[PDB]
């Protein structure tokens, strides 16, 4: 068990010396370097788009903060009526008060109805998009990315060990000890190579990620089309009655 | 007992804490005007909320309005999303189908944002403005007249008390004369109020035309956005 502490100690000292610039870093194969870089960029942008999308869907930030609170509180956040439907209610009530016979009353009541219909259509889009877009992406970021991160750490650690061994051999004098260090060097190199393959294999899966997301984007688009199309028709209908 | 006297004092204080009825016609008109103001205010506010959902933005506007300095031209959600998509697509590679889609969507999104800005401008220019004008101008006048006639009323009510207490013949005659003077002022003010309370009919007509306009703005915005989406659907 204490030997493990020695491994942690060895990995640390080496990390310090390498940072001190006194020690160098064994550069990884260009292919893996390229693969890791691509996966990262992908995650960064996907995260940004997902967030901005959400903001677009739910403009009120304070509402989002309240949801976060109840989410951490493990409680349900009370539902609220959307602005479009609310306006409709006020208008309809006014129209009624002003008098249904009056044209102004007729117009106000007619509009309030259209507004509520529009509000209903809005919620349809929010649910449709959330179900078809945000979640698919979220999945990828939470699962595959995590796994890759873990493997990255393993390979990073192995490299530290390899570099530490190298440095040890560099300062190896006693023939017998130097030979032992040579055995140690062979030992770490093998393990390092093994993890490198493991990592490359996992990184290969990212290729399909882009194609999967493209489908999700096509869906979101269809949703927006549906939302505006419905609202446009609703508006036309209102003008005919008024 | 003592409790009863304390209760009596309490009732007296309630009286400390807490009328010549006008001709029905005027009363009814007054009620109409008040109702109109209440409903008009509610609709004007909610519709502004519908246009600008973000409360913090409104707060900022209020501060900058008091600051008497122009508030920065913040970018709306659609355009920002478009920017992110376009840049991301560029990074992943323009040739790639995914990148192409991202860029296209960003462009359309920015177009939508511009159309939205147009819609916002039109509504506040041909709808919110007139309504606000009316509530801020005519209503004040109306309120002023109401206060004056209310004072004439209180004075008239006092005159009745003076009349009921006018025991001396001279006192009786003086009270009568003052009551007559108050009455004359009352009917004069009443007439003025009646004139203004007959203008509410015209107000309803102007408001109706304003509403018809707002309807046009919403239809135009929805039409424009629908076409943009059609174009993108064709591009991809």
UniProtKB/Swiss-Prot annotation, chain A:
Localization per Swiss-Prot or TrEMBL: Cytoplasm; Golgi apparatus membrane; Mitochondrion outer membrane; Cytoplasmic vesicle, Autophagosome membrane
Residues included from the entire protein: 11 to 252 of 365
Homology family: Belongs to the endophilin family.
Residues with the Phosphothreonine modification: 135
Function: May be required for normal outer mitochondrial membrane dynamics. Required for coatomer-mediated retrograde transport in certain cells. May recruit other proteins to membranes with high curvature. May promote membrane fusion. Involved in activation of caspase-dependent apoptosis by promoting BAX/BAK1 activation. Isoform 1 acts proapoptotic in fibroblasts. Involved in caspase-independent apoptosis during nutrition starvation and involved in the regulation of autophagy. Activates lipid kinase activity of PIK3C3 during autophagy probably by associating with the PI3K complex II (PI3KC3-C2).
Expressed in which tissues: Highly expressed in heart, skeletal muscle, kidney and placenta. Detected at lower levels in brain, colon, thymus, spleen, liver, small intestine, lung and peripheral blood leukocytes.
SUBUNIT field: Homodimer, and heterodimer with SH3GLB2. Binds BAX; induction of apoptosis augments BAX binding. Binds DNM1, HTT, AMPH, BIN1 and ARFGAP1. Interacts with UVRAG; UVRAG bridges the interaction to BECN1 indicative for an association with the PI3K complex II (PI3KC3-C2).
Membrane topology: Peripheral membrane protein
Keyword Acetylation: yes
Keyword Mitochondrion: yes
Residues covered by region (Membrane-binding amphipathic helix): 1-20
Region (Required for membrane binding): 1-27
Keywords: Acetylation, Apoptosis, Autophagy, Coiled coil, Cytoplasm, Cytoplasmic vesicle, Golgi apparatus, Lipid-binding, Membrane, Mitochondrion, Mitochondrion outer membrane, Phosphoprotein, SH3 domain
Protein name, entry field: Endophilin-B1
GO molecular function per UniProt: cadherin binding; fatty acid binding; identical protein binding; lysophosphatidic acid acyltransferase activity; phosphatidylinositol 3-kinase activator activity; protein homodimerization activity
GO-annotated biological processes: 'de novo' post-translational protein folding; apoptotic process; autophagic cell death; autophagy; cellular response to amino acid starvation; cellular response to glucose starvation; membrane fission; membrane organization
Coiled-coil parts of chain: 145-185
Note: HeLa cells lacking SH3GLB1 show dissociation of outer and inner mitochondrial membrane as well as abnormal mitochondrial morphology. Cells overexpressing SH3GLB1 lacking an N-terminal amphipathic helix show a similar phenotype. SH3GLB1 binds liposomes and induces formation of tubules from liposomes. SH3GLB1 lacking the N-terminal amphipathic helix fails to induce liposome tubulation.
GO cellular component: autophagosome membrane; cytoplasm; cytoplasmic vesicle; cytosol; Golgi membrane; membrane; midbody; mitochondrial outer membrane
PTM comment: Phosphorylated at Thr-135 by CDK5; this phosphorylation is required for autophagy induction in starved neurons and facilitates homodimerization.
Domain of life of the organism encoding this protein: Eukaryota
Entry remark concerning the domains of this protein: An N-terminal amphipathic helix, the BAR domain and a second amphipathic helix inserted into helix 1 of the BAR domain (N-BAR domain) induce membrane curvature and bind curved membranes. The SH3 domain is required and sufficient for the interaction with UVRAG.
């Amino acid at each position: 068990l204490a030997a493990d502490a020695g491994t942690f100690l060895s990995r640390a000292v080496q990390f310090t010396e390498e940072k001190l610039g006194q020690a160098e870093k064994t550069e990884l194969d260009a292919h893996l370097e390229n693969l890791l870089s691509k996966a990262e960029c992908t995650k960064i942008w996907t995260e940004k788009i997902m967030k901005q999308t959400e903001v677009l869907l739910q403009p009120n930030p304070n509402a989002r903060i309240e949801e976060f609170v109840y989410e951490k509180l493990d409680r349900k956040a009370p539902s609220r009526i959307n602005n479009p439907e609310l306006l409709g209610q006020y208008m309809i009530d006014a129209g009624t008060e002003f008098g249904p016979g009056t044209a102004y009353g007729n117009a106000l009541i007619k509009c309030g109805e259209t507004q509520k219909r529009i509000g209903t259509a809005d919620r349809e889009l929010i649910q449709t998009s959330a179900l078809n877009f945000l979640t698919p992406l979220r999945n990828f970021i939470e699962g595959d990315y995590k796994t890759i991160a873990k493997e990255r750490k393993l390979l990073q650690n192995k490299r530290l060990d390899l570099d530490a061994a190298k440095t040890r051999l560099k300062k190896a004098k006693a023939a017998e000890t130097r030979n032992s260090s040579e055995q140690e060097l062979r030992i770490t190199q093998s393990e390092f190579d093994r993890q490198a393959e493991i990592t490359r294999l996992l990184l290969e899966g990212i290729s399909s990620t882009h194609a999967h997301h493209l489908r999700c984007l096509n869906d979101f688009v269809e949703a927006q089309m549906t939302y505006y199309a419905q609202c446009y028709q609703y508006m036309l209908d209102l003008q005919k009655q008024l």
